[PDB]
């Protein structure tokens, strides 16, 4: 009837969420408001060196949702070592960049490999976002709140985002180099010359942490995003129909489940530790009060049940177990365990494979350019060929014509033969 939480580590520094990479390392990555990302081994050890240090690039501030917002490891992180983070920087800017772990230290990202995807303008520091996450199709989702930006604002001010209050969806897996991301054909505004192709659906305002069901009971639905928006607080959810090529944005489904009060956020439990929780929505408030939501294959109604046991956010390890980040420089991480089961059921076990240095062909021999998440080596200006080894000439060489040194062809005579 009643759940229990156990401390994993204290002394944290303004934690906002915890997630995993999915590479067998079972490391627990802890996002910190200020702009840090700490690593935590399964056994419970913490790393001396941050996995991501960008407290200079990110503007924190206490009160104010500015700072480190979200992070999302690329599904094939084990191969390409790609990751995507969002944060505020300079009112300010909500930025979404792609980083790449160093090919020498699997426990620290190379800051040189930074690659900006989205830069969103912001006027206030509330209703920001900026939850990042991947879907079953591998596409990247970006939940952005309205950021207190009114219609009048977007109508009498130049240079405003136009993505605020909407759910964005872009394909990072591209064999293209002229762009950071491509728009999925499935998107409502793919091939659209009247609306932003990044926008899948809009209507959000002040969305807390939105719960994500990756295996919806509904056969015709491949993914569902449930958000607890406090705007008069309701709760809207995003339906992503299986095998549907949207030709226009879907409407966020609006319903009022939660009894009464503001909510930090929620999540779906896909763990092994608990059976009486598997598939349940779990939303909690900053006071420590939790609840569980569940629907029905028929009638499609909802029921709210109290969850017996300040909140800053939730986490989840590579094994599905959920965590609770609670409260300067004193944040704590709590793991949720079901008393009706051992702390580690034999079926929940999984040998630990420590993170290893990238080996992919691209990351192995790709010079003068970066690697796309699909293992392609995009060439920087002045290079060509599979891995950008074939020198570029300007003017290019005519009669072969092997270019070597800076714009110095190798014939015939002359600069270009």
């Amino acid at each position: 009837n009643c759940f229990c939480i156990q401390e994993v580590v204290s002394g944290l520094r303004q934690p906002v969420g915890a997630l995993h990479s999915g590479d067998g390392s079972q490391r627990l990555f802890i996002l910190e408001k200020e702009g840090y990302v700490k690593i935590l081994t399964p056994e419970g050890e913490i790393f001396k060196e941050p996995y991501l240090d960008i407290h200079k690039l990110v503007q924190s501030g206490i009160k104010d949702e500015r700072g480190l917002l979200s992070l999302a490891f690329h599904p094939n992180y084990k191969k390409n070592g790609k990751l995507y983070v969002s944060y505020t920087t300079n009112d300010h800017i909500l930025r979404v960049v792609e980083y790449t772990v160093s090919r020498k230290n699997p426990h620290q990202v190379d800051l040189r490999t930074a690659r900006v995807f989205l830069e969103v303008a912001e006027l206030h520091r509330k209703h920001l976002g900026g939850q990042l996450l991947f879907g079953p199709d591998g596409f990247l989702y970006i939940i952005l709140g309205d950021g207190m930006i009114t219609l009048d604002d977007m109508e009498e001010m130049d240079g405003l985002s136009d993505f605020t209050g909407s759910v964005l969806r872009l394909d990072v897996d591209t064999d293209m180099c002229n762009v950071p991301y491509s728009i999925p054909r499935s998107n409502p505004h793919f091939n659209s010359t009247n609306q932003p192709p990044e926008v899948f659906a809009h209507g959000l305002h002040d969305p807390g942490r939105c719960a994500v069901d990756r295996h919806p009971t509904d056969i015709n639905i491949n993914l569902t995003i449930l958000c607890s928006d406090s705007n008069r607080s309701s709760a809207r959810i995003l339906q992503i129909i299986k095998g549907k090529d949207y030709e226009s944005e879907p409407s966020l489904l609006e319903f009022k489940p939660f009894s009464n009060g503001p909510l930090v956020g929620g999540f779906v439990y896909r763990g092994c530790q608990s059976e009486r929780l598997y598939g349940s929505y779990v939303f909690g408030d900053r006071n420590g009060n939790f609840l569980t939501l569940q629907q029905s294959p028929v009638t499609k109604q909802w029921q709210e049940k109290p969850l017996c046991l300040h909140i800053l956010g939730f986490g989840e390890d590579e094994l599905g177990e959920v965590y609770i980040l609670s409260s300067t420089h004193n944040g704590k991480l709590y793991k949720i365990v079901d008393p009706k089961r051992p702390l580690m059921p034999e079926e929940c076990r999984a040998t630990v494979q420590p993170a290893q240095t990238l080996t992919s062909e691209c990351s192995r021999l790709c010079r003068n350019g970066y690697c796309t998440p699909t293992g392609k080596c995009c060439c920087s200006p002045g290079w060509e060929g599979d891995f950008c080894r074939t020198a570029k000439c300007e003017p290019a060489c005519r009669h072969g014509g092997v270019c070597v040194r800076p714009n110095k062809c190798l014939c015939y005579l002359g600069p270009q033969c």
């Binding site: 219609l151 009048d152 977007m154 109508e155 009498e156 001010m157 130049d158 240079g159 405003l160 136009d162 659209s192 010359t193 009247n194 609306q195 932003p196």
Partner: protein, 152 residues
């Protein structure tokens, strides 16, 4: 006439170039002597939001007054009962990215009267044909137009 596409601009260059609206002169404040080059616009066939109540949305350079009044005719002609609406004109401080042509009365943020965004693209085209030296489908909420200075 094929309406401009989202985030598209004509000419396909930066706003402050010789081919476009031209280089930035400076910030034309009220106490600035150059202010008197900005005369109010009282075209009955134009709706000014003037959310500032200052009527700064009407102040604009002669060339802008010409292009605008010429655009206001296309609008009424294109969609009956639908006039040209101006949300922003000449500004007297922060509200646009510095170096903006709104500070000079050379820029205008416009929409239709019915706010129906489905024509915001066609409006941008009618602006290009109206003479505006640079029309930009800025956001889904409005299009941005600008002209050159008397220095052309």
């Amino acid at each position: 006439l094929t309406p401009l596409a989202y985030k598209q601009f004509i000419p396909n260059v930066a706003e402050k170039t010789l081919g476009a609206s031209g280089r930035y002169e400076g910030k034309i404040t009220r106490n600035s002597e150059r202010f008197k080059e900005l005369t109010p616009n009282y075209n009955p066939d134009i709706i000014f939001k003037d959310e500032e109540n200052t009527g700064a949305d009407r102040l604009m350079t002669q060339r802008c007054k010409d292009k605008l009044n010429a655009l206001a005719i296309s609008v009424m002609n294109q969609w009956p009962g639908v006039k040209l609406r101006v949300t922003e004109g000449w500004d007297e401080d922060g509200h646009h990215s510095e170096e903006s042509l709104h500070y000079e009365g050379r820029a205008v943020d416009i929409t239709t009267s019915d706010r129906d965004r489905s024509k915001y693209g066609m409006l941008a085209r009618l602006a290009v044909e109206a003479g505006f030296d640079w029309v930009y489908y800025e956001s889904k909420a409005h299009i941005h137009c600008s002209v050159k200075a008397e220095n052309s």
